[model samples]
Target chain A: IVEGQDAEVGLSPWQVMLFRKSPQELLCGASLISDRWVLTAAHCLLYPPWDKNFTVDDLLVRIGKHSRTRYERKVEKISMLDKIYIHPRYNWKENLDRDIALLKLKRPIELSDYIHPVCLPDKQTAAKLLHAGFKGRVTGWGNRRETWTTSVAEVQPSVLQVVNLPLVERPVCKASTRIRITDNMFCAGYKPGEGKRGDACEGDSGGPFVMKSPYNNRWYQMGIVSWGEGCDRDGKYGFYTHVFRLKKWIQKVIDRLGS
Target chain B: EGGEPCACPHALHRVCGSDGETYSNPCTLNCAKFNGKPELVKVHDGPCEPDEDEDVCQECDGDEYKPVCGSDDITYDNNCRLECASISSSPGVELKHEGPCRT
Candidate 1:
């Protein structure tokens, strides 16, 4: 219903759980790509740059209505990833481009209204072909102001359109950032003039980028709330790993023993 | 809670500088009074602002939205604006474009 950006969004079950954890210490968001696995950024579990445990328990995903301001449920399970995999070329000093990570939940979230996983696009064309005119939802509790006061607890939810970003030519993309925005990633949510306004910020990482399904008229998982520049501003672009790129990886995790 | 030697009484301890030396008397209990050792700084058990919707930091109400995008090189003003030369060319990071950076 927000004007300007045409996004209609919902929070995934896993994302709600993230709200209950160490709020600022652990930056988390979620995406239910399979029956029992959620995807998020690796840096969410390990920020501060010097730690190594990067435990999954460090992340907590919650789902349900009216719980954003209150904790009314128990955490399902601290799903564990068989192993951690940061992009082979992840660089803390320079290019933090491939700072992505995945999580495997212990059980599947029974589908219900208000709380459910967004539909993950199966193919790039399917993703691109999304009703170009349709706006997608981006929801999270990030800082709403540039220099926020120490007492603001309001979650900022807004919608944005997915426009075709003239592919950031390799050199341009590299020139703009240290990490490479590979074909595996897509450049969505770009606007100009509004500084630090398009993507998620400190607390928005690991949340979900929700949008509706153009074909089925149902909500679909668009992207995990990975990283973006300062949140809410225009001009800056938000980056998300193309979920379709790791279908095989997700499938393998789904076939594992606990799953 | 066991990171560094800290002054207690909570409020007073919070005001102590990083030097870990107590110029004030926030710690009423003697080092041996509580548990043979002074109380260490525990979790930031201060009153938290109520939670809200979106990514708003319930406590600060979006007023504390200070994002520093630099190596250890980033500096913040009392108002939390980051003053820096420029955003280091980090992948996936968006530095403030106000030019040369600011605090």
Candidate 2:
């Protein structure tokens, strides 16, 4: 859903939103990687780049809702983070390599049909997904604009927006943006003249970039929303933190911080 | 590399001008450029390239260590790097003692 004109419900049960203090205003998107752990980009927590340290009490994770405009008070699930694990090598000055982070909820979420954990693929399996032509979908409450000039107040969509972006080769991504894309990062987005404009923008950071498993019916998360210049434009590719590279690190953290 | 001529006054700071000449500072550099002489532009921070052997600290490796403080009052990496920095800087940056920097 590049434009607000189209919205979907219950399509991505693992999709979640990160809110600062007010539930009405969303800061970033997250995916329920586990019953008690939410996965998102580390940069979302450290943007403006001045703060050196932050506590888990600063954020709220909202899940099980599709539309930001309407949701039953009892039906929605919100929780506080007990701890957060930012990748030790996550360097802001280094162009967002190892840009993923995990937020551990104070308590385990009650998994429902509307809210569930996403499947994480192993390194080998993930590489297969990449070789299979890099088809994936990204969803978030970020801006839905056809042009950069569109104000957030004008086109912020209440319902979750989903977009289909194909992966671009590493060399192509390098030529498209000035920033260096490292091994831990991958590019996926609309190509110029594709006639379909579907890309994530500001506020969409930390969301899931998942692909359907060819071996299984389940969806496997392949990337996390990290950075981009602008959305829905050719040569303006969005870079994501390759989840495959972080699988072992994520598993170690989860095991050490058992829910 | 091409633009309007600048007419600034001389200052006391030493700077390297783009014209390959050393000037007192940026003010004189621009002034030289303003005079239509082979104009000077700032090339680097200071009179010349930074010394390759300058005793600067290395990037942190992000490991948990007992941690020590440097004479600069910043937290130095493990004792090994701390000692390396101390020896590298001559009379040397000393370990301000254990743990990260304290107010």
Candidate 3:
């Protein structure tokens, strides 16, 4: 999360870290949607530093985390993946259109002050709030520079990062990159050369883009950080998976992969 | 278009498969075999050296999870992540290992 501030504990309780149990690596960030269910990007699962037929046994999750290494082992919940579901339309080689996934935990998380579930946006709520100008809160431990263009001069924060970017019009969002802005995704953050400079970089993928709705005064997980061209640059806003548009499919997956 | 379309994660740089394509990881190359290029085989442990310019390291301006250790003892998030760092370092940073270092 470039151009963002460091996050303190309890700031994003639902924020979780995706890790590998075998080689032990930080893969991507995800959000705890429910006690036993977590939503993240499919590319994090399907594409890999591992083989394409990646085993679920190797998948692991750490919840209730603040610092990557300082988080209490007892407080943070770790679970082996029970099952995995990548959306049928998820094509990583192509422009990441349906880049969403669901993971079922073998052991359910014990919700606490530091660990909890985030609310999914209702279709009505999403439509009303997701229009241009609503503020959405995105948190992660990603690149501190926002964009990966030019050089890899390092700035990966050890602690979690947070940024509040306003939603923008689709036309404004589409202008930033060469990638397709399909119906399954939406745009947030400043347009090229405007507003506060912040965006989701590499490590932020599959993390939450949640918004607190004024209508109901609750946080709703509206988008999942998918992919983008760069950050803090013209036409470099972050693109996220539109949660409301895919809720039906998500619900069906939840039904099939019952808790 | 014949079998399933190959769907490899843009995760890391690893394994030079026999097909000479630079896959993010060997597993991604395995997916290519499963999807379309059935004759492909794993050839080595690191990313395929560009004999014909599919240089994966050149594309490391992004994120990395399988962080490679550098000569300066800094842990680069990925090999390419380190590759990008090598450009500006005084001693020309070199990869030492595959996982992260220290913490």
Candidate 4:
């Protein structure tokens, strides 16, 4: 992996899906954890609260399929992971801390070469694991150029370096970017230009921020797509909710749900 | 039929284009191949680096406040100070400051 070379490391077999709205309006991207459970951004669920002309039920999750125009089965169920975790010190003015969400299918789907699970790092080691040489991969359906879009599950990997956590810190982050980094987040990205190669865009949110498994040399989930300023801009940064940071919470959710 | 094929056994095995046509085999050049380069678009992964234009400081802001490992209260500044301050203010900030901290 050169500093800024383009590779075909897109999504894995186990990580492709479509968000269905009347079979015509559909969004496509990667599945973060498992088939039964999906992870996506908060804004994607931006539908109306009241039936007052808003309907998310039409939003379906199509799993284990390929080809933009033609593919496979329908999603078991749609689980929009929007947990109301008020930032311990949330200042609506500043910004909300937790923006990531999860999706759990009504039933678990079968895994295959096209449908496999990504490795998840021990929650304790996520932050410490990200370093300059730490290579990681991300996948999704976003624009490569300004006018391009992909339905194919493409996975691109890049190395991690210790950059500043701007927004989380006011002066630098706020000065450079107008937003804050929030809590339980870390910064990672190449400076814009030749070195700035990899990035996550609009459709990539809530997808897994993964690293190649050391044990099996497979992709493992490290974080969930939280937010970022821009894609490969001169100084834009990508912030993720440390998957490890939410280990206990996730476990609690699973334990309580008895899944 | 005289030229010898360069047999390097390419590591990228999926692209077999040796027959002048795209055959999903090695580079035989058989088919009108859709070059491996991406025609679609999306932000997948970002190269890891420190946040852009950020400096090495002590802490983040708002939480509480505490000194990082190896540093005392005086050396904290910028993000470092803010992070330390936030943590110190934490009702029970992690005491595992055994790791290195800015002075």
DockQ of each: 0.02, 0.01, 0.05, 0.01
Q: Judged by lDDT, which candidate is best?
A: 3
Query: Model 1: what is its DockQ?
Result: 0.02
lDDT of 1 at B94: 27
lDDT per residue for candidate 2 within A94-129, as digits (tens), equals 476798888888888898878888899876677578
lDDT of 1 by residue, A103-209 (tens): 65555666555445556666753555444334455555443332123234422333212222222233433343334456555544544542213444444555555
> What is the fnat of model 3 with respect to the true interface contacts?
0.04
By TM-score, the best candidate is 3
Preferred candidate (TM-score higher): 2 or 3: 3
Q: Candidate 1: TM-score?
A: 0.54
The TM-scores, one per candidate, come to: 0.54, 0.67, 0.70, 0.52
User: Which one wins by TM-score: 1 or 3?
Assistant: 3
Ranking by TM-score: 3, 2, 1, 4
lDDT of 2 by residue, B1-103 (tens): 2211221111113356676555433544554665676544678634453323432234333535767888678686676566444323322345677888898
Candidate 3 Cα misplacement greater than 4 A, ranges: A48-53, A146-154, A257-259, B1-103
The global Cα lDDT (0 to 1) of model 3 is 0.70
Worst 10 residues of 2 chain A by lDDT: A46-55
Which portions of model 4 show Cα errors greater than 4 Å?
A1-11, A26-32, A46-56, A72-96, A147-176, A215-218, B1-103
Task: Give the CA lDDT, 0 to 100, for residue A142 in model 3.
Answer: 65
Candidate 4: docking tier = incorrect
